[PDB]
């Protein structure tokens, strides 16, 4: 699925950062 269980992903809920930290520096030469 509904909208009520899909709006609640707009708030951050990872509780770990081992993916969004490293690949944020890799993505820009990958699209370059």
């Amino acid at each position: 699925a509904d909208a009520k269980a899909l709006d609640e992903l707009r708030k951050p809920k990872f509780s770990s950062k081992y993916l969004i930290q490293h690949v944020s520096q890799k993505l820009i030469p990958a699209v370059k």
Binding site: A1, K4, A5, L6, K13, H22, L27, A30
Partner: protein, 193 residues
């Protein structure tokens, strides 16, 4: 060949990917690792524009999208499950289905973690004897041995009491609806008696 059964059945074509993902990560017992990885990918889609351009643009070729999702997910300790999932979902342009495959995966894991949510909405901040007496009356609405959590919201429209929001059933034990059903019960008798 031998896949463990999902705790609750679900819908098609986006919930089936979540069913297969829960089955595979339950064969590997990484059921909370890949949930964290999918949450990280949701926020990663939120952060940058060159990644959501891989899911909303229809003029990106599938070769560069497959090679970008492989060469990005080569490293950083990513699971084999999430890597092969994103490879298969980027080969077919199904990266926009991430936001509604992870919700069905969360419903599946919430069925497994044996934990059901609720939300009690009130008028005053609850005190500790109000709360421990609330849990005994709200547990009688669950149907097995679960871990029903109790969320708190405050809304001044109720004149005391509590309303339980289970996201599928609603128990209105409030006084504002008690007096609302009271004034409806009188006026059906004054017109008659």
């Amino acid at each position: 060949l031998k896949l463990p059964t999902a705790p609750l059945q679900l819908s098609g074509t986006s919930a089936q990917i979540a069913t297969l993902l829960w089955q595979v990560a339950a064969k590997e017992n990484q059921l909370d690792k890949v949930q964290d990885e999918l949450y990280q990918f949701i926020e990663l889609f939120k952060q940058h524009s060159e990644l959501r351009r891989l899911a909303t643009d229809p003029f990106v070729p599938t070769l560069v999208r497959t090679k970008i999702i492989s060469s990005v997910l080569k490293d950083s300790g990513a699971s084999e499950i999430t890597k092969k999932l994103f490879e298969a979902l980027a080969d077919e342009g199904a990266l926009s289905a991430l936001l509604e495959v992870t919700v069905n995966y969360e419903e599946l894991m919430l069925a497994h973690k044996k934990e059901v949510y609720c939300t009690v909405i009130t008028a005053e901040p609850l005190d500790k004897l109000e709360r421990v007496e609330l849990t005994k009356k709200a547990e009688k609405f669950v149907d097995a041995g679960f871990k029903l959590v109790m969320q708190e919201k405050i809304d001044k429209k109720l004149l005391g009491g509590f309303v339980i929001e289970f996201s599928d059933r609603r128990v209105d034990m409030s006084t504002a609806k008690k007096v609302e059903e009271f004034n409806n019960f009188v006026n059906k008798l004054v017109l008659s008696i």
